Amino acid sequence: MGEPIHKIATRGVMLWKEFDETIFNLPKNKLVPTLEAKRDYIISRLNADFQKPWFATVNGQARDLATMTYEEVAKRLVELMFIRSTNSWFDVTWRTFTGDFLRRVEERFTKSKTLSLIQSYSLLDKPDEAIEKVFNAYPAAREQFLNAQDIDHFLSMCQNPMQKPVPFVPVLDRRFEIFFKKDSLWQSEHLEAVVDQDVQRTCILHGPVAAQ
Amino acid sequence: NGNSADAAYAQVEIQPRANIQLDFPELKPYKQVKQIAPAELEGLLDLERVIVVTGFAEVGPWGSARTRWEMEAFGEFSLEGCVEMAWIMGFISYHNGNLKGRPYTGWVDSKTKEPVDDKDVKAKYETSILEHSGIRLIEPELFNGYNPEKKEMIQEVIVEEDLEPFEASKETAEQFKHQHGDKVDIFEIPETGEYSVKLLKGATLYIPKALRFDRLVAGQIPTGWNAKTYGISDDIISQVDPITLFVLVSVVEAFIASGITDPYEMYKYVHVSEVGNCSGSGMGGVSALRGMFKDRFKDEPVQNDILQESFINTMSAWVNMLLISSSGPIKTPVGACATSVESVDIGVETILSGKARICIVGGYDDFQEEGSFEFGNMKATSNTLEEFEHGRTPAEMSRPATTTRNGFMEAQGAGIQIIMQADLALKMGVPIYGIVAMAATATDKIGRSVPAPGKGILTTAREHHSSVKYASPNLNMKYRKRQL
Amino acid sequence: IADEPVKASLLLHVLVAHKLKKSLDSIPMSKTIKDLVGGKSTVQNEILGDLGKEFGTTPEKPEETPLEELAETFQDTFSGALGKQSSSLLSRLISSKMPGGFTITVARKYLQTRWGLPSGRQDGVLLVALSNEPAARLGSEADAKAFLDSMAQKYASIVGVDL
Amino acid sequence: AKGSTLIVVPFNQGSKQDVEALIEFIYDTEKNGGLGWDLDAIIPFAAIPEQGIELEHIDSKSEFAHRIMLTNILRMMGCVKKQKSARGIETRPAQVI
Amino acid sequence: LRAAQQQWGNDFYKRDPRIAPLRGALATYGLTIDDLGVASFHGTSTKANDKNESATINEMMKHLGRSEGNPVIGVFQKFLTGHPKGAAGAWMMNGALQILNSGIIPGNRNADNVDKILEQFEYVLYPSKTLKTDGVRAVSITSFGFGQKGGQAIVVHPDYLYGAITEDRYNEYVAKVSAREKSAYKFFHNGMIYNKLFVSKEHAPYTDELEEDVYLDPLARVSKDKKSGSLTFNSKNIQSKD
Amino acid sequence: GVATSFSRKKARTFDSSWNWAKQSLLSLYFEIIHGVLKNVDREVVSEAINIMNRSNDALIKFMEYHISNTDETKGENYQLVKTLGEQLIENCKQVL
């Protein structure tokens, strides 16, 4: 909302500052055309420097949601939202997001009415076994890119107000400043749930003078 | 025991969503696809001289080639077919965003905007889809009001008593005076500056009358089909003959079947002079021919360039002007019913000559009042009153090879294939649906009936059998592979 | 109600609008003829021909210059004269798409009677009607009256008078 | 099977006009637009159901049903008899089942 | 090399009057006349056409010595679609391809009673219901227009092509198709829900300045422009030694 | 109820058994190869009856070609169709 904040000049915050000077200051008409012009740069610098990485990234290769398989999307969800060190989902609402996705996978690839292989999202507390199980019953979803309808769904779920903001940027659009800046403060206290446990990704609030 | 013990018991049902496939050919492992062909075939064929089909599409009475093939092969729509048909016919549209305060992503009824689920598309629409698809009674809304029950004509009559004067502009009245001569009196009205036209006794007049025509049924592109659905702009729709719209959709949809979403991609591999268009028509833009012959004569407002939209080669032009932007061959054939096979033969020879490496082939034709009428006068089409006498429904009026067959059922649409050199298809990694092994045209012989089918194409099987006592080593691929 | 001659800013708008087969407001005045028909050279030269037949003398290369400025360029020499093209088009509208026996005279008399609009205003109401070609011969006398009522509203709206 | 034929004709056994026509059609020569057959068997199984129609409820339906299931079966047998006797056929009787 | 391959592989039977074009077109891929499984007939539903076509296919097959008891299976797609004049054979060709790639042969469901006259043509079978076969190797497409326009096209199963290439070249193709298929599906669904399968081009791939330079260089090719992202002709890749 | 339904023009004739025989054989042949009919299913015997009831020289040649050109090594279902085929040809020859 344009208010000044004093933060430790980490890579994440330097990216933030840079985007405030070059992208977020632009008028609404100029924001969208500027994002495609810089897209390849932004996606690289989110993945390197920030606490919210580019979602659509498979083994370092910067894809887009439309050019990711259903399996790549379900795995990437686990790698950003489930904590290996403490074998649990950082937030229940993130486990819901990932279960809701996997049900959508079953809907898109089932030929007739069936029973979900995920009867309760409690089963996702073993996320590898749940993914193996779903993508064994629907192996077509290992090979196909996301249906355009399922991309639109996924971004609809990323904007759900009754859940914790997703710890990634899924699309460059008018909504990019909110995906970048929303929910910036928790990471500093939960580095286990940040990409490489990298403090340098995070926003830490601190005074210039009190720092002495 | 409360609802707690009966809530963990309660199971979650998954309902299928239509995952429409492009049905690319299924490529086998090399060990298996090496079993069908002889072992000698490897490095025997010049792959620039082999023509393959890398994409195809159509627009016709059962929607696209996907939906038509479902209805041809299985005689019923799958979830995917039923959703595709509902989207084509404009029954359902896609919605992403806020709907009635809740956020909703999926299908909605196009009229009401009520959300529709894919399971419910069959119950809600399939009866409406089957009723307004395929061979069925002629829908006047689809043919500029044309109702074959009430087919408009004009009879010339010599008037026997003077008419009441009517007001007309000066220029209009002058045009009445010129036409009629002394058999009309035009007089200025000083007050208003307009003129009073009085038709006198002996003047020629035209009184509209209606004939009840007997061809009531046709294969018609599903009701609610709309080029705007595929994303063709209004300015293109307002300019071109309806037949052009079937071609533009068939061509983009054939490119998609070839996995070529951007046609300019072809220009990474071939010159702009190596992309042909050999697609043709029998009659071309017959809606534009009606415009220039009939609607102009009746002084209706018809666009000035209607003539260009009539030409059989204008559909291929619009394809090149809106999508392809090639400077390759353009060889528009006119083969009546055999246009599309001639189109392939030209396209094959264009590629084998080296004048192209890729070629859009196919054919297209519209159904309209005047054609329908003239195929009736030639007794080529089935008389629908005789079919109704015999108890036949519209869906059983086209019955080839049958004892009681009594003429053809006129339809409308377009079919397109993309043909390429094999060598370039492999290089580009485009799907390959089949090899065009042969194409040929043939006339018949001396005769006096244009519509009489003859046996000319039998020549494709011509061979000499006088001396066939010992097999020719030319038929033996092992002999040919040795000589190579 | 006071009489005015028809402004070239309206007449030119209506001729363009009618020629492109578009609503009067879907075309913006501050946007040139070469941009309107950017594709079809045939249609461009055909509007230029109509502007010639209408106003007589045309400026030098006026197709790249906006409608809004070309209004005032034509306006100087123009003097509330319907002219060959507009007079023809209005006669075709009436002759072709009016209930029958409902001509120029009884259209203008109905405008003068009910709405009290004189010759110069009448011309304007008929021109905005030429923008909104009903596409079918409308059936009864009551439908024609209702049509001119509704087109007199859009005329009052566009010029800025009250009824 | 080989030699078999199946002719499917619309027919309302409730119409006596239909019964006469159907047997005229079967028996009439192919020149006149018939089958030029001569029946060996008649199997008149046509019938409409009545449920919960006791004596007090016997009306238009039950009287029509009786026409289908008795009266017009007698009239089919009649029509077949008249066509066979017209052609002096006395040694090829139709088995009515 | 190509000229040799053409002489022995593609065009062996052109100077040879003992090989019919129809027999040579199959023989190219090691197929025999008995491998022409399906004949998609014009089959307009007219008295004269359906008999003539049946007689004409039957005589082709009989001359080329097709094995007794091996009729071609007739497909009469027009029972469903009707006859769209110029488009007729294109629909048949679309359906011939769909047959080859599925092995499913559709049935003429309006073939209530096959005409007794057509029994004399022993090399034609007229099915009324769909046959899931174990494979079709080749389909014949015959049209007959007004004005003596006879046409025939043979379409062969595409799996006969891949026997002509090495495993390395086959496996490279299969990788590109898989990738292209995925991108096509991506494009198809996007365009369908957003009504933008058809996208008119605003501009040629060249500017009006490069237009005559591109036309005159046979090796000119488009490349991805960094700014627009669209495929264009660059001045660098026109009359370049590379 | 006594409305006339009957018209001669509406009479549909079916007499083309020569054609359906071949279709019925070829339908069976592929149903056995695709494992839809097994060697225990009675519909194999029923269909064989309906093919013997349509036996003629053209149908026997149709069988002899389709069966004698079955590669039995392609799978067990192909051995089953070739064994049954051979038997049904013998049957069709006797009841010619």
UniProtKB/Swiss-Prot annotation, chain A:
It comes from the Eukaryota. [Alpha(6)beta(6)] hexamers of two multifunctional subunits (alpha and beta). Belongs to the fungal fatty acid synthetase subunit beta family. Fatty acid synthetase catalyzes the formation of long-chain fatty acids from acetyl-CoA, malonyl-CoA and NADPH. The beta subunit contains domains for: [acyl-carrier-protein] acetyltransferase and malonyltransferase, S-acyl fatty acid synthase thioesterase, enoyl-[acyl-carrier-protein] reductase, and 3-hydroxypalmitoyl-[acyl-carrier-protein] dehydratase. Present with 91800 molecules/cell in log phase SD medium. This is Fatty acid synthase subunit beta. It comes from Saccharomyces cerevisiae (strain ATCC 204508 / S288c). The gene is FAS1.
Curated annotation (Swiss-Prot), chain C:
It comes from the Eukaryota. Residues 6-81 form the Carrier domain. Signal peptide: none annotated. Coiled coil: none annotated. Present with 17000 molecules/cell in log phase SD medium. [Alpha(6)beta(6)] hexamers of two multifunctional subunits (alpha and beta). Belongs to the thiolase-like superfamily. Fungal fatty acid synthetase subunit alpha family. Fatty acid synthetase catalyzes the formation of long-chain fatty acids from acetyl-CoA, malonyl-CoA and NADPH. The alpha subunit contains domains for: acyl carrier protein, 3-oxoacyl-[acyl-carrier-protein] reductase, and 3-oxoacyl-[acyl-carrier-protein] synthase. This subunit coordinates the binding of the six beta subunits to the enzyme complex. This is Fatty acid synthase subunit alpha.
